[PDB]
Structures are given as C-alpha cells and as structure tokens.
Amino acid sequence: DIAGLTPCSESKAYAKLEKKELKTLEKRLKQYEADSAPAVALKATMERTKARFANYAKAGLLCGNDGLPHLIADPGLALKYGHAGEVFIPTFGFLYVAGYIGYVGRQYLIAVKGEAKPTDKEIIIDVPLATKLAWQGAGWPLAAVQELQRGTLLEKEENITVSPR
Amino acid sequence: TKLFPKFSQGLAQDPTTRRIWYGLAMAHDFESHDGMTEENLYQKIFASHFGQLSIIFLWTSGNLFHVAWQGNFEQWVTDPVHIRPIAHAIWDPHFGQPAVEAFTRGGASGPVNISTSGVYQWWYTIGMRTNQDLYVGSVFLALVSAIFLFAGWLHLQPNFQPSLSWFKDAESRLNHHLSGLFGVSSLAWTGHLVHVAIPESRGQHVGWDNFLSVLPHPQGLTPFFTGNWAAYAQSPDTASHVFGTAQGSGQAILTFLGGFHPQTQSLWLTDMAHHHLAIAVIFIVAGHMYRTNFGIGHRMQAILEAHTPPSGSLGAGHKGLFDTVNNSLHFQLGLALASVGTITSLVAQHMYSLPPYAFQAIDFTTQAALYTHHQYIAGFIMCGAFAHGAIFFIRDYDPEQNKGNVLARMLDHKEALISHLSWVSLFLGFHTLGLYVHNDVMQAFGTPEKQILIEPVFAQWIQAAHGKALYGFDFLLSSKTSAAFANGQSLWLPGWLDAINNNQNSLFLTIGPGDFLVHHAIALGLHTTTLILVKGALDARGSKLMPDKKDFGYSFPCDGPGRGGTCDISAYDAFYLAVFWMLNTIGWVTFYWHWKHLTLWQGNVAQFDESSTYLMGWLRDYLWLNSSQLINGYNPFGMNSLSVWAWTFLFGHLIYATGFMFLISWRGYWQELIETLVWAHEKTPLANLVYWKDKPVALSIVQARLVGLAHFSVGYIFTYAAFLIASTSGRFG
Amino acid sequence: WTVPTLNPDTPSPIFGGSTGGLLRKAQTEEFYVITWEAKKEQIFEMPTGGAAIMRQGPNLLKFGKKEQCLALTTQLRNKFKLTPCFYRVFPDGKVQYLHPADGVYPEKVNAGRVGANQNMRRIGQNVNPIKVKFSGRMMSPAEI
Amino acid sequence: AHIVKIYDTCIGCTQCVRACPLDVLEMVPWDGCKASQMASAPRTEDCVGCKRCETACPTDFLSVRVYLGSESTRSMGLSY
Amino acid sequence: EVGPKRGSLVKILRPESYWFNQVGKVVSVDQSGVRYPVVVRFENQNYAGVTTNNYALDEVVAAK
Amino acid sequence: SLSIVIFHFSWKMQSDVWGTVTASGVSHITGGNFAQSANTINGWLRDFLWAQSSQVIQSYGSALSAYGLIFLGAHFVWAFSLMFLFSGRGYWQELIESIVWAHNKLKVAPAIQPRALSITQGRAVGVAHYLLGGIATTWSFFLARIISVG
Amino acid sequence: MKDFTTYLSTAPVIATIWFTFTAGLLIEINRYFPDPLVFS
Numbered sequence A: 001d002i003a004g005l006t007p008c009s010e011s012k013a014y015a016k017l018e019k020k021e022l023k024t025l026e027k028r029l030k031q032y033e034a035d036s037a038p039a040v041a042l043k044a045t046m047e048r049t050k051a052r053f054a055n056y057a058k059a060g061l062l063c064g065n066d067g068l069p070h071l072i073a074d075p076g077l078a079l080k081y082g083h084a085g086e087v088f089i090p091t092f093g094f095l096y097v098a099g100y101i102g103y104v105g106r107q108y109l110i111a112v113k114g115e116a117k118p119t120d121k122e123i124i125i126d127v128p129l130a131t132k133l134a135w136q137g138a139g140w141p142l143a144a145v146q147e148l149q150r151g152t153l154l155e156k157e158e159n160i161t162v163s164p165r
Numbered sequence B: 001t002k003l004f005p006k007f008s009q010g011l012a013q014d015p016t017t018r019r020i021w022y023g024l025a026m027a028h029d030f031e032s033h034d035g036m037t038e039e040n041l042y043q044k045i046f047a048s049h050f051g052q053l054s055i056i057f058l059w060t061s062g063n064l065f066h067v068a069w070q071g072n073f074e075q076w077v078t079d080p081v082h083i084r085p086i087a088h089a090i091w092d093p094h095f096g097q098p099a100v101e102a103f104t105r106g107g108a109s110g111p112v113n114i115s116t117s118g119v120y121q122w123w124y125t126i127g128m129r130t131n132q133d134l135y136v137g138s139v140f141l142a143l144v145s146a147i148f149l150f151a152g153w154l155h156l157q158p159n160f161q162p163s164l165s166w167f168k169d170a171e172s173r174l175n176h177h178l179s180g181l182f183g184v185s186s187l188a189w190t191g192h193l194v195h196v197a198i199p200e201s202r203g204q205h206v207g208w209d210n211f212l213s214v215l216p217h218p219q220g221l222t223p224f225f226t227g228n229w230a231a232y233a234q235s236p237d238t239a240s241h242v243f244g245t246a247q248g249s250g251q252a253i254l255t256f257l258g259g260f261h262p263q264t265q266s267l268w269l270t271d272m273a274h275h276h277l278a279i280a281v282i283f284i285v286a287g288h289m290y291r292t293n294f295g296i297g298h299r300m301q302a303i304l305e306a307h308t309p310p311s312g313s314l315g316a317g318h319k320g321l322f323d324t325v326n327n328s329l330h331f332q333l334g335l336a337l338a339s340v341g342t343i344t345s346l347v348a349q350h351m352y353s354l355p356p357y358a359f360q361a362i363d364f365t366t367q368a369a370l371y372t373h374h375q376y377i378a379g380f381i382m383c384g385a386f387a388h389g390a391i392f393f394i395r396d397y398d399p400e401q402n403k404g405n406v407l408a409r410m411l412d413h414k415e416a417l418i419s420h421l422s423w424v425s426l427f428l429g430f431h432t433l434g435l436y437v438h439n440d441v442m443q444a445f446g447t448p449e450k451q452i453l454i455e456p457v458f459a460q461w462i463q464a465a466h467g468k469a470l471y472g473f474d475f476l477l478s479s480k481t482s483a484a485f486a487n488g489q490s491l492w493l494p495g496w497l498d499a500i501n502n503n504q505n506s507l508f509l510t511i512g513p514g515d516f517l518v519h520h521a522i523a524l525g526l527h528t529t530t531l532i533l534v535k536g537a538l539d540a541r542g543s544k545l546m547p548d549k550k551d552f553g554y555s556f557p558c559d560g561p562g563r564g565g566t567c568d569i570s571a572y573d574a575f576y577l578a579v580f581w582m583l584n585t586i587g588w589v590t591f592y593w594h595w596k597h598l599t600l601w602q603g604n605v606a607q608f609d610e611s612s613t614y615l616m617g618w619l620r621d622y623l624w625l626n627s628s629q630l631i632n633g634y635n636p637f638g639m640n641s642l643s644v645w646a647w648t649f650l651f652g653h654l655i656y657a658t659g660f661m662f663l664i665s666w667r668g669y670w671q672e673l674i675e676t677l678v679w680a681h682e683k684t685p686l687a688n689l690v691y692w693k694d695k696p697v698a699l700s701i702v703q704a705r706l707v708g709l710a711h712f713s714v715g716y717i718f719t720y721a722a723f724l725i726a727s728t729s730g731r732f733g
Numbered sequence C: 001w002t003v004p005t006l007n008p009d010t011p012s013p014i015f016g017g018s019t020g021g022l023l024r025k026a027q028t029e030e031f032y033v034i035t036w037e038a039k040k041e042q043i044f045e046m047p048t049g050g051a052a053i054m055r056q057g058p059n060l061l062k063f064g065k066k067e068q069c070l071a072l073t074t075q076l077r078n079k080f081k082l083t084p085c086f087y088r089v090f091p092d093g094k095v096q097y098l099h100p101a102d103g104v105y106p107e108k109v110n111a112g113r114v115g116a117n118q119n120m121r122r123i124g125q126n127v128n129p130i131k132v133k134f135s136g137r138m139m140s141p142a143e144i
Numbered sequence D: 001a002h003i004v005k006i007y008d009t010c011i012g013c014t015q016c017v018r019a020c021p022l023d024v025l026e027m028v029p030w031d032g033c034k035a036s037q038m039a040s041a042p043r044t045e046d047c048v049g050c051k052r053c054e055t056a057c058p059t060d061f062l063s064v065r066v067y068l069g070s071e072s073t074r075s076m077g078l079s080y
Numbered sequence E: 001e002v003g004p005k006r007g008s009l010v011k012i013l014r015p016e017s018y019w020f021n022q023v024g025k026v027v028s029v030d031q032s033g034v035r036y037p038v039v040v041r042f043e044n045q046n047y048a049g050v051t052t053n054n055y056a057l058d059e060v061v062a063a064k
Numbered sequence F: 001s002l003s004i005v006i007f008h009f010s011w012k013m014q015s016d017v018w019g020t021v022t023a024s025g026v027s028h029i030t031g032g033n034f035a036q037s038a039n040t041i042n043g044w045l046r047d048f049l050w051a052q053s054s055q056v057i058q059s060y061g062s063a064l065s066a067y068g069l070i071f072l073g074a075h076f077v078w079a080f081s082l083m084f085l086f087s088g089r090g091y092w093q094e095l096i097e098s099i100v101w102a103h104n105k106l107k108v109a110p111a112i113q114p115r116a117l118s119i120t121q122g123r124a125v126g127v128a129h130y131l132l133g134g135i136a137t138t139w140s141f142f143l144a145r146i147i148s149v150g
Numbered sequence G: 001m002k003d004f005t006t007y008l009s010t011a012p013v014i015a016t017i018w019f020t021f022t023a024g025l026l027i028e029i030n031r032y033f034p035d036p037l038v039f040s
Ligand code: CLA
Pocket: A074, A075, A076, A077, A080, B457, B458, B461
C-alpha cells in the first residue's frame, strides 16, 4: 500500500501477533479455577486484547513487515487515503487544548498585573478569577487572532529590556 | 625570575605550580604573548603551518614504512577477501607466552596488530602492488617532510619574512589556491589515474621505469586535440572484469558508468578519473575570478559593498565586512573550521555508502572505524568553529566599523535567535523522549502493537525520487516514463539504479519507524549543541548578569558569588558545556550507524526494525548483546587476541570516571587539603632536607574544567573505539 | 599621629600552640606581627584554630599572611572593642607598618589621602578590547 | 597583582572598604557625590581577588571592579 | 527646578543598567550639581537584590 | 563505598551460600565463581554486572517488567544529574534572560522574576538526583535478579 | 474559615487538586475507552 505497507486487516504477521499474546494469557489461565478471582481478571484481559486487535484492523491502519501499526504524518497522504485520524486530526486536537491552557494562563497573568501586589497573587491563586478565565478560554482562537490584528498581542521593542550590544 | 615561559612575564613571576601548567597552555596563543605585534603574529603562524605540514607527511611516511616492513601487503593483494591486513609488529617485553601466540596471525613472523584504517584498500586501489612501491613512497614523503620543515625555517630569516600586507592579499591567494592548489592538484591526480592506477587495475604494470613508453589509450591524444572526446569512453571494463587482471578488462579511461564495480563493490576507476578531470576544469576556471596585477577580475570588497538589498531588510548589508574578515584571524579560522568540519561529515556520509576503495565494503571493521573516526573529528572541529567565532566577538569585533551591517544586526536580535533555538530543543526533546518512553512501556506491558511508529514518509519519498522502487511512490527516477528517467538512461542511470535497488549494499538503506525516532534524536543533538555554542558567542561580549564581560576576555573563572552567583559565565565555559552535547550527539549518530550495519552484515535487519523503536532494545540487543566477546578477551581460563580491546575497554571507563572528579569536586576543597600536605612535608625529619621550587597549589578553576573535559573525552573515545572494533572484528573478522 | 615602632619584646597571649602556625615561609620571605592593648584578660579565637587568653596590657602575635592578621583585627575590634595594629616583618630585620596606614581605619574618610585607581567614567564607557590590542601585553580596556 | 578600579558612580557608602578582608580599599574626600567621599584602591598589591567588595557595592552596575591578573604569593593567598 | 518631578515615572536609558528600557518612580533629584542626582525606585529587584539606583539627567526620560 | 559493600554481599551469597540442595550436593546460583573471578575488575564487569543483569533486561512482557522500566528510568535520572554537577548557574541565568525576553515580547512574563538556582542548590539538586538514579538502578537490578532466580 | 480557604488557594494545594483532577479524568477516559491509538 503506502510506502510498501499493507492494511493490518490483511497482514499475516499482524494476525500471528494476536495469537501469541492470547496464547500467553491462556497459558497462565489454566493454573487457576474456572470462576476464581484470578481467572476472571485474565479473561477480562483476553477480551480487551481481542477487542484491541479488531479495532485497529477496523480503523484501517497500515502494518509493516513487523506486523505492527504504522502512522501516516503527511497531510496529503493522510487525507488522500483516509488516515486523517492518526496524526492530522490529533494535531489540531492538541493545539486547541495547548492554546487553551496557554491563553488562560496569559489572561490571568495580565489580570493580576493591575493589582497592588502581583507577586502575592501568583503563589496564592485567586481561584474565583481563575475559574472565570478558565471558562472563557474556550474561544481562545477567536480572541487570540483579534488581538494579533489589533496589534495588542506583542510588546513594543522599546519597552523590553535588552543587554548591551 | 624563572625563564619559562619566555613569552609571558606574568607567568614567569608566578612562584607556584600554576606557572608550569599555564605556560604549556598559553604557548600557542600568540596574540597574548609579550611584545607581540601584528606583523610578527602572521610570520609565527606561517612558520607553524610549515611545521604542521611536515608532521603530516612524516606521519604518512611512518605508515607506509611500517606496512612495507612489517605488514603483509604483498600477500593481502593476492586474496584481499580472506586476509586480515597487518598494521605493525609488536615488541612488548611484558607479554607472556600465551599473549605472544595469541597475537601471532596472518602468517606473520611474530605478534602483530591488524590494521583498521583501510590504507591497504586505498593503496591497492591507486596502483600499489609490491612492498618496494610502498618503500619508495615512504622515502619520498620523508623527503617532502624535510623540505617543508626547511621552508618553515627559510621564511623566518631576515630577507625572507613576508610583510604584513603579503598575508592580507586576499584576491591573489584565492586565485592561486582555487586554480593551482585545487585545480592543478586534481588535474595531476587525473594523470595518475589515467597513467598508473587504471592500467594497474587491468593487469598492466606501469612505473617510473616505463610509463613514458606506455600509451594510456590506444588512440593517443588524437581524440583530445580533435574534440572527439567520446573516444575515451568506449569499451569500458565489463561486469566480468577481475580487478588487477587483464581478463574482462576494457580500454576506456573516462566513463560515467555511475554504479559499483561488481567484484570490488566500489566506484569505477574510470568514473573517478572523469570526476577529477571535471572538477579540475571548473576549479582552474574558477581561479581566474579575482583581481591581480593584470587589470582584470573582481575585487572582493566591491562585491560585498554592492549586495545591500534595496528595501533595507538587511540594514547596511555587507558593507564593512571585507575589513572585518580580512583583519581578524579568528573570523577566518571560524569559517575554515566550519567549512572543513562540515566536509568531514560529508566524507563520512559518502564513503560508507559510495565506497571508493576496492574490497572496502567487505572489511566491516574498517568501514565502522572510518565512519566513526571522521564523525568524531567533525564534531570537535564544529565546536572549535563556534569557539573561535566567540573569540572573534570579544577580541576582533569593532562595533563602529560594522555599524548596521548583517553582523551587527545578528547581535540586535540575539534573544530571538536563542529563544527559538531553545524552543526547538525543548520540542524535540519532549516528544522524542516521550515517544521512546511510550514504546518502552508498551513493550514492558507486552503490547507491542500499541506503540507509536511513524513512517518516515518524507525521507522515503526522497529515496523514491532517486530510484528506490520499494516504497511504490513511482516518482521521478522511480518512474520509467519521467523525463528525468529517460534523459539519464544512457549515461549513469543503469548503473546507479542497479546499485540503489541492491539491498545488500549501504547505498540508500531502507528506512522505517526505527530510523524516524533516531533521526529526530540527532536533530535534538544538533540544535541543542548549536544553542549552547551560539549563546556562548552572542553573549560573549556581555549580558544582563555581566554587562561588561568583554573586559575580562574569552576565558575567566567567574565573577564571584555576588549577584546570585556567576559560575561558568564566560564564553569559554559555553564551549566547555557544548563539548558534552557534541559527544552525546556524535554518540547517537555512531550507535545508529553501527547497529543498523551490524544487522545488515548479519542479514537479520529485522532485529533493528523491531528492537530500535524502544530504548530497552538498544541497551539489550546492541550494547549488552555485542559486549559478550569483548569482555571475554581475557578470563580466568585464558586470553585471546581480543584481550587488548578488553583491557582498553576498561581503560576507557577508568579515564572517563576520573574526569568526574575534576568536574564534580572543585578547587576550594583541594587547596585546603594540599595545605596539610605542605605542613606534613616541612615537619617530617629526613624529608624536609629535600624541598620544592614551585609552591604546590591546587589546579585553577578554569584548568580543572579542561582537565576534567579531557579525561571525559578520552575515556569516551577509548571505550567506544575498543567496543566498536572488538564487536565488529570478532563477529566477522 | 606618627608611625608606631614595633617592640619585639611585647608579651604574647597565653596559648598552648597548634599546627596551624608559621611555616618555612616566615624564615625566608616575610611574616606579619599584630599588636594591641587589652583592658582585661579574656579568651579569643585564633584564626589559626583554637582559643587563646589575651594578657592585660600589650599583646603580640605572629601570623603567616596578612589576611590572618586582619581577620583577628576584625574580631578584636567588633567584639571586644579594641584597636589593634599589625606590621610586615622581613627576614632581614626590616619592619613595615600598615593598617592603619595613616592612623585612621580606612572605613572612615580622612583628609590627606590621595585617590588611587579611580576612573572618572562608568563601567559602560570603557573602550572595546580591539582598541587595546597589541599593546605589548594582555591589557583590559579598564586599564587604559 | 590584580587590578581594582573605582568608577565615578560611587556613592560613598563605604561598604566595599568594610567588606575587603585585606585592607586594600579606603575612602577619600570627593565632590562628585552627596557623601562627598569616594572609594580608593591604594594597596592592590595585597588584593587576593575574593571580590567581596563587588558583592557589597549597591550601585548598578558596580562602581568597584576587580580584574584578576598576574599571580604572586600575596595574590594567591599563600602562607607557605 | 532640575530633573523630573518627585513621584513621576521615568524610563531608564543606561544600557548597562538592570532596568534599561524599564519604568521606575523618581524618589528625589539632587540640586547640588552631582554627577547622578536623579534617584529612581523600581518594583522589581536586580540580581543583587537592590531596588533603587542613581541616574544622570540625560539617562532618564519621562514615561513615553 | 556502600555500592561495593552490597555488590560484595550479593555476589558472595549467590556464589558460596545460596543454592539448591540435591543428592550430589549444593549447587549455588552462580556456581562458586566468586573465588576465581572477583580478583580482577574485568571479572566484576563480566561475571557480576553483565551476567546478572540478564534478568532485568529480559523482564519486558512479564510481571517483573516494572523493574526493567525502573532500571532504564534510574539510568536516566543519574545521567540527568550530571547536568547540574558539571555546570554553573552563570550559564543558566543568561539562558533565562533570552527566554524571559520571549515572554516579555508576548506580554506573558511572570511577576515573580525567574532566577537560575543558587550555586548551593545546583550542588544539592545534582547529588540528590545522582544518588536516586544510582541507588534505584541497583535496586531494580537486585530485585529483578534475585526474584527471578532466587 | 477565610484563612483556611486561603491556605487551600496556595500554589502547592491548587496543583495537587488540579493534577489529581486532571489525572483522574485521563484515567477514567482510558477506563471506558481502553487502548486509544487513532481518532477514528
Ligand atoms: C513538512 C513538509 C512536507 C513534505 C516533505 C511533504 C511531502 C509530500 N507531500 Mg505534503 N503537505 C505538507 C507538508 C509536506 N509534504 C503540508 C504542511 C501540507 C498542508 C497541510 C501538505 C499537503 C499535501 C497535499 C495536499 C499533497 C501532499 C503531497 C505530498 C507528496 C508529493 C508532493 C509534495 O508535497 O512534494 C514535496 C513537498 C513540498 C515541496 C512542500 C509543500 C507541499 C505542498 C503543500 C503540497 C504539494 C502537492 C502537489 C502539488 C501534488 C501534485 C500531485 C502529485 C501526485 C505529484 C510528498 C510525499 C501530495 C501527495 O499526496 O502525493 C502522493 C499531495 O497531494 N502534501
């Protein structure tokens, strides 16, 4: 398929890998009773193992000669062949959360700079203010862009201290 | 006061042992000597370069002499596949009889060392066939060494010392070095290949005794002067040619086959002849570019002054840079080390994948040593390139004469440069380490299918563009309908495509997720090492914590415990910290090269593909697995030929650990300890009769950092050298 | 105020002795002598280690380097409120007096002192290292 | 011998003189500051380079600077 | 009559100062013709823990 | 010093005391190789550290796989500590200045001024990580070994 | 009670609660959606 890979659902090594893991679990099972606590736990593990291998094959991943899933990172190859969920979609999932956390913290830091004693508002958090800013961060991409266009996102070069040069 | 050192009265007046250590360590810093002038500085450097050249040719002479005297070159040339080369003989009176027998091998008279430098394959390829060939070369280079040494003496004499302006004639030196040093030398080397090397590869002897009566080509210079240059590319060596013999050989002296000689698995000699002829023409032409006494050519100052973007994006542009470069030796040395350091890496990269010497590929130990050798030397040279760039800013940089040009503007946004290098290093470290740890946890819990394996699609896409059809991209040279494929299909593609699609050679090895992780670790090493070195240079002239750092020099201990503490604040210390990261980076590179090749050389590439995605595989399947033979070199039952590498392996660990002492424990502890030793000696009867002349003191703050770094580096190098050679040689050799 | 003259016969504190005292340097290069007046017998700490009792009246001690003498001076002045002075003594018998150089401790401003190593500029107004290059020796921009 | 320089930003606090453990510095009359006194370094041959004076200077940047130079028995702080 | 008013905010222009390009509050201005009459206080301490420093008339400018 | 004490105890017990009793006699875990091998540094490297670390490095996929992870993680913490021991805060305070500039540029600079650790805290942080990494490395190596064979 | 709630607002206490909450959410998600590798 892509880069010589093959779908895991059609991979011989991938299928053999599942048997090896289940065989290991089964070997430990036969030293217990039918419905003892250890036996129930082992059976639960085997169910998750079978579900995991079905899900990855159902997801249409690609397996190498090693018979293990490999991920596609190029946006063009991902959208071309329906691998957007491996890296491409999670890329924009993380950035939204990462910007959320960073934007909320920046809003709080600006908020307390106006207070009389900003330092005491950092070791001792103003929880009522933090919760207020936590909820308003859901729209950070909109607020972040509007700050950039209005020119209030960055400090002026003349207001930033620098070393002699 | 003491005589030594003669070049510094400050040191000579010091009554302590620091005088001895510092005298050695400042010998070659000519700029800091007493009474030094600019003109005398250049003449000393010119003389020193003659000394370095003489050592290089004497070192080469010693290698030629010992192989001929004690090696088995004449036996090796007969059957290079199944004979281990001999470096030199061993005369160690400490050896026991089992050791003498153990190191006797290769049909030698007595104990000998096996060569790993590849000089056998190199010398055999260039036409050497007998011990007398090596003897004449050894005497010739010993003579050349003497001549350079004499020239070093000659140009120090009253009537032969060049003036200051002579050393600053940039246009004339570039014209000569490009056309003569590069161009003519490459043209001459083409002559050797056409007249000597190629005939010797076809079973015909050509020496000084008969080379004037032997025709390199059946049509002698008629094609050359008539423009019918294609006649020299007809009837090349066939695929059945046996190197060194006339069976299967051809007649062409200039070709573009583009592949590997099927038997020797190395580049064709007729391609290496045409290669050197081609660049020689380019270099000779390129050497007619600059102004001289003949009224034509460019003046480099004019070129720099012109290139200022009209929009003011680069400020003043390159105005004032000619004097900045032409007047500073540290600027010139930084550019020389940066350029040479990169080319040393390029040599390592291209020599392992395009082996130019016959039977070099099959000598696995030689290939491993050659790649590791040059990558570690490249790493040191790169650190030096930045060190002397930092020294330039402190010593030679003049803000007034560089007002508003590119160099000055680099200091203007140094925080932006350092901040972004910091971000890239953090990003690569977090995600590179994180993915490795994730894969390790998955392996520990027995779920190898849950790990994050990212296919190197971008690098696999490049290999497709070069003709590797495994990945099925069918791109450019991988597609038989592209214009790129068609145009080259008659010159070099048939040979190139045949080699790149052979998976038993190192030409564009197949890559997978294991290679993805390691490459991103290499990027982390390059960026972090650059961050440390770049910060050391841009902050060399000063910082908020020390606004006037330039007034103290490149290397000073500290500014004291005030202002919070200033340990390791000089630009010298930034270089010192960067050497650790350079060793770490080159270590990752050489581990990656070695492990990927051991699995290839054993045919079980699957081990690397499976075990390289988590860090337990490296520790288990590479370091632990391949140490079994090394540490058995000597054991309670006996010893074998690997006992020297087993001994050197522990020798490295000891020097490395000793370096920790100079890096962890600092001066104040040791100076107070030495004071009780001074008391003890003076009060001891029968020993206080003897006394010292230099008052004992502890090493300095700066000295111990260098001494600790030297032990750290030496132990680093000797440990891996012993393991690299022992693991590779024992496995196959 | 006139330069005091050292009296080698001055009594010394009651001290058993230690291994932290003078070495062969005192016999070849120099040593230092500190003297002071004591109001009453008291125990003080020797910079070389241990405790000594100062006799009432004049006291004299010999030390291996200047910093040791001025370390004891700080103790006597700050804690016991005395006023010591010490010298530099050479093996040839010459005696050099210092601290207080002019009789008044340096912390207190005194007329008649001449400023030394004073630059009438800021640290940020020094020249660049390139402008003091090839001056015959390693010279900082601050020196010129 | 080390090099010790006093710059014209001195405010005459006397803290450098008190801090010095070898009586290298002293205060002298001056007219360039409110205190009408300035630090002086008349005895730099006894300086050891501890930089306690720089630790004690309030001005920013420092008004007293120590440049470590040639070593000797006195500057190396040896008692042997 | 010389220098900025007491309590006003000024921007520091001494490149070697910890507070270069930063705003501080003027405490007093000496009228005795000393080299550095202006005294400025800052809310953030420097590396030595100090929060006040003396500046010349031309080394300080009014906020903006 | 204590690392050698616990290596001495571990090798001596396995070699000369611990073992399985059978009809012929006592077979020890390491088969009495202490006497002939522990007189060279190479013997300790090969027979003790290299041979007995087989259990810990093969622990993945089993109930002892946790010791394998901590064996690597301990190696990491130990090497991480050398950063604090081999460096000084002068470099790090200047590095933070450039990092602070980026935050100032984005109006996200903290009110509590970032500072590189003090000189003493660098030494305290270094030795604490050095000890934790070194001791935890032996801890994983001992338990994965003795539990597996003992 | 005002001072006690002020103590709970100190940085170490907030971080412990916040990471205890954050860790719990991630642990619970993986309890009901075991082995997530691809968004799907
Ligand atoms: C990080 C850099 C990088 C690299 C090395 C690649 C590499 C590749 N991309 Mg990807 N791509 C990237 C980033 C990158 N991409 C980004 C950031 C985006 C936007 C989110 C895309 C969007 C994208 C699309 C839409 C497509 C590719 C495709 C490709 C492949 C061929 C064309 C190409 O991009 O040539 C080298 C790459 C560059 C010079 C960088 C810019 C690439 C642009 C954005 C896309 C070019 C597409 C091209 C015009 C398609 C023509 C048809 C093709 C079959 C020949 C190649 C494997 C094509 C593919 O699937 O081929 C099989 C394709 O259709 N890429």
